[PDB]
CSV table of N, CA and C in Angstrom, one decimal:
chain,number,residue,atom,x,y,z
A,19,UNK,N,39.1,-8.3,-18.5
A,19,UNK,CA,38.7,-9.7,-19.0
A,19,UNK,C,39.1,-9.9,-20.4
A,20,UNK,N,38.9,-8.6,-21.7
A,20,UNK,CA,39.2,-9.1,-22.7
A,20,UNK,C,40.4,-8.6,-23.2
A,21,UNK,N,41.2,-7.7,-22.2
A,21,UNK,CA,42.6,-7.7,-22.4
A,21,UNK,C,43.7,-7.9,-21.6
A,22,UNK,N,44.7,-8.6,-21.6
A,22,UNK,CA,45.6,-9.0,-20.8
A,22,UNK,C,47.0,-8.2,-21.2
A,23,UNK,N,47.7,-8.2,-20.1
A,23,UNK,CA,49.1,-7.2,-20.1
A,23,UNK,C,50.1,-8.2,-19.8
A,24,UNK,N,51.0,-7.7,-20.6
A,24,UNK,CA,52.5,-8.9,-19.6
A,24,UNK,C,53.9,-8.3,-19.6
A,25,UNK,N,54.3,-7.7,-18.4
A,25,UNK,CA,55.3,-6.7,-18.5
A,25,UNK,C,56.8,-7.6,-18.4
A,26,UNK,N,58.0,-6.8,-19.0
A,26,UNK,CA,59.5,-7.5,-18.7
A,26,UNK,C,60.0,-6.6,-19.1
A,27,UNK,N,61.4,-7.0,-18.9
A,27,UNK,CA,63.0,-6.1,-18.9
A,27,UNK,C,63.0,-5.8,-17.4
A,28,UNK,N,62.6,-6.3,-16.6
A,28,UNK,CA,63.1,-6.2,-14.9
A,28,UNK,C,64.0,-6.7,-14.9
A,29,UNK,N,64.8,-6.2,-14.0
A,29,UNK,CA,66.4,-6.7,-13.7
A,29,UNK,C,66.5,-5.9,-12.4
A,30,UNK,N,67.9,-6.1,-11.8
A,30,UNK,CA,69.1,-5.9,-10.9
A,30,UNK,C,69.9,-4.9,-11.7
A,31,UNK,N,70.2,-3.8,-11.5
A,31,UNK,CA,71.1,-3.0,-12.3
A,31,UNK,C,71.8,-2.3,-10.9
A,32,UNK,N,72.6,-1.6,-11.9
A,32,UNK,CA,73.8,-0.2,-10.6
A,32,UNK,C,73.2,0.9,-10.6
A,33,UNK,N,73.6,1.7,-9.5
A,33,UNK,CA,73.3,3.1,-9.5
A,33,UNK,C,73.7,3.8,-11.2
A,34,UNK,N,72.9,4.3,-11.7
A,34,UNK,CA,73.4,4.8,-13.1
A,34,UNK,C,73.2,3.9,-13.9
A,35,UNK,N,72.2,2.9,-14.4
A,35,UNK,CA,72.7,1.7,-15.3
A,35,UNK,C,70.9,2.7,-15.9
A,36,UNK,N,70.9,2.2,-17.4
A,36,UNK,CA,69.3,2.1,-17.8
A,36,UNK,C,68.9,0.5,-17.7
A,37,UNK,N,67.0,0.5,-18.7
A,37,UNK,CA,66.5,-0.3,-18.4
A,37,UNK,C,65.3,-0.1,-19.5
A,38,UNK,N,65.0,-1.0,-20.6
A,38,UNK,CA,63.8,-0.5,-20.9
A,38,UNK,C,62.9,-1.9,-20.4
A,39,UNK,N,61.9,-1.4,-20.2
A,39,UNK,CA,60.7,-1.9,-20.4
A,39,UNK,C,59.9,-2.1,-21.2
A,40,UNK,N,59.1,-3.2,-21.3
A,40,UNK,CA,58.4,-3.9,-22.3
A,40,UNK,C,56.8,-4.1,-21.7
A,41,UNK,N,55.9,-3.7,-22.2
A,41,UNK,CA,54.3,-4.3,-21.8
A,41,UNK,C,53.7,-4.4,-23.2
A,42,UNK,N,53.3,-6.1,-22.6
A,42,UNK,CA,52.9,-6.5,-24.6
A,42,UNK,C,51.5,-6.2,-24.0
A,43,UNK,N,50.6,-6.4,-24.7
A,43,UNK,CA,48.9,-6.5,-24.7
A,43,UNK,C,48.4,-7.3,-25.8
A,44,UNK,N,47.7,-7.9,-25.5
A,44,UNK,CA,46.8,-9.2,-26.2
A,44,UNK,C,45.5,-8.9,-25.7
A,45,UNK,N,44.6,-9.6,-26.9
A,45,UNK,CA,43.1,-10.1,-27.0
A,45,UNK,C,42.6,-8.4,-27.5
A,46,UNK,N,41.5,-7.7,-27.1
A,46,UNK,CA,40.8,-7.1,-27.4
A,46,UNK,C,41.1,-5.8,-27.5
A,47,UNK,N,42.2,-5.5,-28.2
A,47,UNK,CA,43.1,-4.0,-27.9
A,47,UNK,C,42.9,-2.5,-29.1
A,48,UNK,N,42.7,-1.4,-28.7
A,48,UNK,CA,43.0,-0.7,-29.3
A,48,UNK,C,44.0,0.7,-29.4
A,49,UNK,N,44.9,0.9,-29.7
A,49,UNK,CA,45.9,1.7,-29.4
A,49,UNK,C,46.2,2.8,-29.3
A,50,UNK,N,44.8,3.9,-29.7
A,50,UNK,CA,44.8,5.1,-28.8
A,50,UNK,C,44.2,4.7,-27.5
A,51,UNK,N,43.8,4.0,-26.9
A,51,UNK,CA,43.8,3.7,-25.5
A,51,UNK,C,44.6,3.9,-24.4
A,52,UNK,N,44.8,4.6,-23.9
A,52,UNK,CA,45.7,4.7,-22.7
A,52,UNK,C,46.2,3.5,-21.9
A,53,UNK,N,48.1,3.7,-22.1
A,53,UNK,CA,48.5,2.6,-21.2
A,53,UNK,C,49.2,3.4,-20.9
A,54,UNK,N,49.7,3.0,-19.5
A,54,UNK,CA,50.7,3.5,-18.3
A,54,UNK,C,51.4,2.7,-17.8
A,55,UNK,N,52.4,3.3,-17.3
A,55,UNK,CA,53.4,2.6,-16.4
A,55,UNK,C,53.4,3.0,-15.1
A,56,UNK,N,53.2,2.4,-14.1
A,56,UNK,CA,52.6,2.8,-12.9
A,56,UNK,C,54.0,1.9,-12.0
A,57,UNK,N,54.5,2.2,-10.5
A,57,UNK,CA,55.7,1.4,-9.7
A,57,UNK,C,55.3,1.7,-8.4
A,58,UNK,N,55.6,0.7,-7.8
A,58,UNK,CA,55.3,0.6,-6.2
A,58,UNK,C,56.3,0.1,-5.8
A,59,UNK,N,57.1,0.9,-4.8
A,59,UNK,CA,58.2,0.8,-4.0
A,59,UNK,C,58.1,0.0,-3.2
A,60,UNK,N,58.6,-0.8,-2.2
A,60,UNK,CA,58.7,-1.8,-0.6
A,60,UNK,C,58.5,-0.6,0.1
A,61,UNK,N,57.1,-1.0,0.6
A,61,UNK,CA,56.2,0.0,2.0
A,61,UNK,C,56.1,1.6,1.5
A,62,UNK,N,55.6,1.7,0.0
A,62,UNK,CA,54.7,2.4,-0.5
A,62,UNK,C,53.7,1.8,-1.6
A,63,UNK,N,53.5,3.2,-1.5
A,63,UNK,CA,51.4,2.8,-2.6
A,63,UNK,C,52.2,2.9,-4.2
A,64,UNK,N,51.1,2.2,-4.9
A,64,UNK,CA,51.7,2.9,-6.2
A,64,UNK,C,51.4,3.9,-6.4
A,65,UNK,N,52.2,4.7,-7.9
A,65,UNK,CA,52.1,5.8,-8.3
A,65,UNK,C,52.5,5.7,-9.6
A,66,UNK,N,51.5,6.8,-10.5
A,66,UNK,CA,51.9,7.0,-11.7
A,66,UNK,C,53.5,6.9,-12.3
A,67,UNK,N,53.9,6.7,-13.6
A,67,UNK,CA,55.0,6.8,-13.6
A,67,UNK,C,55.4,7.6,-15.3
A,68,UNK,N,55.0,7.2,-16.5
A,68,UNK,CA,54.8,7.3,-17.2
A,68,UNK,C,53.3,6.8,-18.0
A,69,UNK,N,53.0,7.3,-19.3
A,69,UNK,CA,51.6,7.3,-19.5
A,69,UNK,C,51.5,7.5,-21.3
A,70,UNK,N,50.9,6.9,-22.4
A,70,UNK,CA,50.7,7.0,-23.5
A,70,UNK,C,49.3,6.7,-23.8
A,71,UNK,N,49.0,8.1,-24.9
A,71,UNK,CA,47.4,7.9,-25.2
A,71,UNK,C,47.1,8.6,-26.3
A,72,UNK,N,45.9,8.7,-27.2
A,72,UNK,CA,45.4,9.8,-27.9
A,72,UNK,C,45.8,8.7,-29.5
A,73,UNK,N,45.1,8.9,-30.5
A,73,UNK,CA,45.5,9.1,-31.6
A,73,UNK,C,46.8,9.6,-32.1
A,74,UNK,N,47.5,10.5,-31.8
A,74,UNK,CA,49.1,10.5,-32.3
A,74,UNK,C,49.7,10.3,-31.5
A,75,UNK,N,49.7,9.7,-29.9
A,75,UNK,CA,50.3,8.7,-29.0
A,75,UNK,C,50.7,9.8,-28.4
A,76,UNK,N,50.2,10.8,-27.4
A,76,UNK,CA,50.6,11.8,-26.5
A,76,UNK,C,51.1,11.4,-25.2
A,77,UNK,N,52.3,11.3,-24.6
A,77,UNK,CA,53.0,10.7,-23.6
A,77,UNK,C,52.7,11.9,-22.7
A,78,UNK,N,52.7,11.4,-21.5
A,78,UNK,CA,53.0,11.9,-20.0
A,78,UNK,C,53.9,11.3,-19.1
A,79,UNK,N,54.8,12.4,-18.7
A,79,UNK,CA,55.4,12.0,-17.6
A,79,UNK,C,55.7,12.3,-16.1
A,80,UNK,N,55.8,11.3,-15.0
A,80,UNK,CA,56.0,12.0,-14.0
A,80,UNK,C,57.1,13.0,-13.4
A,81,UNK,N,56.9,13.5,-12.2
A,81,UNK,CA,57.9,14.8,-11.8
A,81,UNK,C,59.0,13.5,-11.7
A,82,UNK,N,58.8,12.6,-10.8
A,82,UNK,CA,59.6,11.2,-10.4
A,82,UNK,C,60.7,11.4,-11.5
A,83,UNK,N,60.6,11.2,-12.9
A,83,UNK,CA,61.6,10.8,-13.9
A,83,UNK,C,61.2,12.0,-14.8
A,84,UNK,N,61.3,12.8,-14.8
A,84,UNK,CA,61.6,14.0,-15.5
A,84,UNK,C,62.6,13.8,-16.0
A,85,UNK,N,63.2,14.4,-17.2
A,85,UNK,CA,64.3,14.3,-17.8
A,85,UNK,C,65.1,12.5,-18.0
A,86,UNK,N,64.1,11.8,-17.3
A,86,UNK,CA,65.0,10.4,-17.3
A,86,UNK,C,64.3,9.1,-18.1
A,87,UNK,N,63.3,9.4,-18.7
A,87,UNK,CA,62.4,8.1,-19.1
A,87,UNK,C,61.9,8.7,-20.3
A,88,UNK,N,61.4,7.4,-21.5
A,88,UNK,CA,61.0,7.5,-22.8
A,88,UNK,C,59.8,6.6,-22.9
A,89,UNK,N,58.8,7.2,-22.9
A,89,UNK,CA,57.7,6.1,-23.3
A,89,UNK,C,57.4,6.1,-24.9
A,90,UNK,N,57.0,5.1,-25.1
A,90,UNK,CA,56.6,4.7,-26.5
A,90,UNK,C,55.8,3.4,-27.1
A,91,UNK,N,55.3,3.6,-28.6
A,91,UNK,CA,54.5,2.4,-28.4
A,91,UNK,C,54.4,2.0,-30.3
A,92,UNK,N,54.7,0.6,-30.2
A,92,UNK,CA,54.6,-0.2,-31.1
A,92,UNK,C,53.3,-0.9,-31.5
A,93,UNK,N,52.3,-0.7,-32.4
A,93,UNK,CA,50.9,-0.4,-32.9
A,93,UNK,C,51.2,-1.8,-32.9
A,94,UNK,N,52.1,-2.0,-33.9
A,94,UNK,CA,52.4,-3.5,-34.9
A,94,UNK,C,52.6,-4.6,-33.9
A,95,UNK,N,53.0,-4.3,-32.8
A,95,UNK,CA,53.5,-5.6,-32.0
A,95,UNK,C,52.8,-5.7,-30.8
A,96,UNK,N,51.7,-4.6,-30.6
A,96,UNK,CA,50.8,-4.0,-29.4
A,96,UNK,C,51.5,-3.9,-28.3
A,97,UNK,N,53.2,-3.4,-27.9
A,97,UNK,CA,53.7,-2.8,-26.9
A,97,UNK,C,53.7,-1.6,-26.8
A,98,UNK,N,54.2,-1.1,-25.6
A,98,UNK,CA,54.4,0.1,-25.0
A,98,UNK,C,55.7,-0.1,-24.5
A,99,UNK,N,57.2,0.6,-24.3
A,99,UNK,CA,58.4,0.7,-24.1
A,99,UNK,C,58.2,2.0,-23.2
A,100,UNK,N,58.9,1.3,-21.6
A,100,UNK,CA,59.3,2.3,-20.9
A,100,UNK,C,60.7,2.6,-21.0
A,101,UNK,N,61.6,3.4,-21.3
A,101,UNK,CA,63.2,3.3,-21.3
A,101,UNK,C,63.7,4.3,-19.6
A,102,UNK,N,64.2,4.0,-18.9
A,102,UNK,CA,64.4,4.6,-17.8
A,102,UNK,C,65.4,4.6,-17.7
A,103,UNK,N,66.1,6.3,-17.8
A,103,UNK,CA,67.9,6.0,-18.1
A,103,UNK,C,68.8,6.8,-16.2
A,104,UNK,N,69.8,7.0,-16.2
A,104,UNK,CA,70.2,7.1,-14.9
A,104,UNK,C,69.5,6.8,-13.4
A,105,UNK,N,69.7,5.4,-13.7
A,105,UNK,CA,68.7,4.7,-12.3
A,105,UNK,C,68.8,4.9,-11.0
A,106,UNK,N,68.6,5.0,-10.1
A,106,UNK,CA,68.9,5.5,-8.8
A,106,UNK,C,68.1,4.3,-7.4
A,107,UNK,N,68.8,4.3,-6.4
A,107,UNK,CA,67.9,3.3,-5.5
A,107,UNK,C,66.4,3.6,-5.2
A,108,UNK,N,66.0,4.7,-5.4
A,108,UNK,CA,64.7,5.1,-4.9
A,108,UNK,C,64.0,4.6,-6.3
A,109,UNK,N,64.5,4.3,-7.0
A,109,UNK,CA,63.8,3.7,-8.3
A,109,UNK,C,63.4,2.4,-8.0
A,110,UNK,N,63.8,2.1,-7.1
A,110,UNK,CA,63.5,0.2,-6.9
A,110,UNK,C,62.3,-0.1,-6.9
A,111,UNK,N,61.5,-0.7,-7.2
A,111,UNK,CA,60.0,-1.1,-6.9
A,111,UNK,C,59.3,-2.0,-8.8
A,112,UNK,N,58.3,-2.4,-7.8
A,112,UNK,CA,57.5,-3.4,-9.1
A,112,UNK,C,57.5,-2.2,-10.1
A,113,UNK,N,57.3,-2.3,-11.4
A,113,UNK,CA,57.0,-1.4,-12.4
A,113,UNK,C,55.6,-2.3,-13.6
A,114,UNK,N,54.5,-1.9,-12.8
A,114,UNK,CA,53.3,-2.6,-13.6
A,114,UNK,C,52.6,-1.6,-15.1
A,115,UNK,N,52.1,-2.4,-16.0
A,115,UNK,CA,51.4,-1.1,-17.0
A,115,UNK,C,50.2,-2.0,-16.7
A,116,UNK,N,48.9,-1.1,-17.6
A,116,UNK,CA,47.6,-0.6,-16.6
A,116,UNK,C,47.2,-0.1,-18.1
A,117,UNK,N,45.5,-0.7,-18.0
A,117,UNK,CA,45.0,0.8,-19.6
A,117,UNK,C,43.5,0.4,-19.1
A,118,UNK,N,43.0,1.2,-20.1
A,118,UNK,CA,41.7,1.6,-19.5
A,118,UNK,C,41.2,2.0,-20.8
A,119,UNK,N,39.3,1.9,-20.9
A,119,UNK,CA,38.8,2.5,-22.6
A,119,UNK,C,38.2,3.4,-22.5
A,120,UNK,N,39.2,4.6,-22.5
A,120,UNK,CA,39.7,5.4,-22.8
A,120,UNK,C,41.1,6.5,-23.1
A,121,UNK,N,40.7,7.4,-24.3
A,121,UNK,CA,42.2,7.9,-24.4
A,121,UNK,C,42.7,8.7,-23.7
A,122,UNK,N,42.5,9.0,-22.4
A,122,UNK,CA,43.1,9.9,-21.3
A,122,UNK,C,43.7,9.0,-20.6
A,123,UNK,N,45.2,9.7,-20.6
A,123,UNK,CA,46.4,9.1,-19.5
A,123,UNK,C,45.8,9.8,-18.1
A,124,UNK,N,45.6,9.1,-17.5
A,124,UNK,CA,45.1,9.7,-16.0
A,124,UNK,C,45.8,9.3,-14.7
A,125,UNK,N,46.4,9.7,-13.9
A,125,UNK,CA,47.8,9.6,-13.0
A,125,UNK,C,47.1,8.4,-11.5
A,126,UNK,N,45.5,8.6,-11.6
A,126,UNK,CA,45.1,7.5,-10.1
A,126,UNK,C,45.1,6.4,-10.7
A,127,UNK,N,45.8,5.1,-10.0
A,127,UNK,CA,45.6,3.6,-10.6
A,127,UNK,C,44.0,3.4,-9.9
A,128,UNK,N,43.3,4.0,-9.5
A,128,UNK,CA,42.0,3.5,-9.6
A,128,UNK,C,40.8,3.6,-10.7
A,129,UNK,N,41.5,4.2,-11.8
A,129,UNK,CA,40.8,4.5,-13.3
A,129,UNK,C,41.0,3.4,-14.0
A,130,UNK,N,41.9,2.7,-13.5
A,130,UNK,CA,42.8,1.8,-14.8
A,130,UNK,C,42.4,0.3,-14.3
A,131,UNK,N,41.4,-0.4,-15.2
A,131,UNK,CA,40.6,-1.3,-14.8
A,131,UNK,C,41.5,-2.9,-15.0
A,132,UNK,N,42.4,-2.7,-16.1
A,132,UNK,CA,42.9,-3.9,-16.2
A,132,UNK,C,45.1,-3.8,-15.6
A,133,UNK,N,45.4,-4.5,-15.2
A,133,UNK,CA,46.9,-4.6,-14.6
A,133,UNK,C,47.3,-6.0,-15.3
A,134,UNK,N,48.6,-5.3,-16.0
A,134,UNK,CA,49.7,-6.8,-15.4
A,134,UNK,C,50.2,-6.7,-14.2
A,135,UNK,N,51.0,-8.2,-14.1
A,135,UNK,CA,51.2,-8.4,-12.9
A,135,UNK,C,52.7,-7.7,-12.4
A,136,UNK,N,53.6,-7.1,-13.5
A,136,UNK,CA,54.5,-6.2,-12.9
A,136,UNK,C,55.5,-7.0,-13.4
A,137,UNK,N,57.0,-6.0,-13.2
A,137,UNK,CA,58.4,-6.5,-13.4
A,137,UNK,C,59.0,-5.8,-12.3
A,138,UNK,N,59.5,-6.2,-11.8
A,138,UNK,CA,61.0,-5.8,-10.6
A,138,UNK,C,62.2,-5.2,-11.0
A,139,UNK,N,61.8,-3.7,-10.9
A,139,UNK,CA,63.4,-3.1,-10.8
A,139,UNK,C,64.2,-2.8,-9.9
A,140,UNK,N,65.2,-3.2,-9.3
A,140,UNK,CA,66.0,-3.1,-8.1
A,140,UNK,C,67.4,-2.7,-8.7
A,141,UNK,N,67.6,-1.1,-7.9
A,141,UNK,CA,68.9,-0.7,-8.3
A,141,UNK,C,69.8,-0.6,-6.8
A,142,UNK,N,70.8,-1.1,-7.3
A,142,UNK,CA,71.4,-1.2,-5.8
A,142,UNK,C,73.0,0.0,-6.3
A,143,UNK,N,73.4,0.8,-5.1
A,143,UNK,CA,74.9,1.2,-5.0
A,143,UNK,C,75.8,0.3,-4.9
């Protein structure tokens, strides 16, 4: 209710292209609060994806993009940046961020009370 999310940098990219991501937040925010980036495939559930939290901004990542994604976060402009580099087709799916009051990144979207409505990454060969 008193905070809203609004995600972008979705696109159409190639096998191998990056992509960052953008989730602003507005109204009632505080920035050790945990925000995530969570993605739902066509005819899968979501799932965690990346995650920032804590007073010195402690990231989590999934096994999914090990070695391939950079999360981070802009206090001053109240975003969070997903950077997802060597894209692959199983990468395809909405890419929504998610937070919750509190500072634990927690991996079930059933903790995370507020959603944006998502961006679309589709990588095609």
């Amino acid at each position: 209710a008193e905070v809203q999310l609004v995600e972008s940098g979705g696109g159409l990219v190639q096998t191998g292209d990056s992509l960052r991501l953008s989730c602003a937040a507005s109204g009632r925010t505080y920035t050790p609060y945990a925000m995530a980036w969570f993605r739902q495939a066509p005819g899968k559930e979501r799932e965690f994806v990346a995650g920032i939290g804590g007073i010195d901004g402690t990231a989590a990542y999934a096994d999914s993009v090990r070695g391939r994604a950079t999360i981070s976060r802009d206090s001053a402009k109240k975003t969070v940046y997903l950077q997802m580099n060597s894209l692959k087709p199983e990468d395809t799916a909405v890419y929504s961020c998610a937070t919750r009051a509190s500072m634990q990144v927690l991996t079930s979207p059933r903790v995370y009370p507020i959603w944006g409505r998502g961006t679309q990454v589709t990588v095609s060969s």
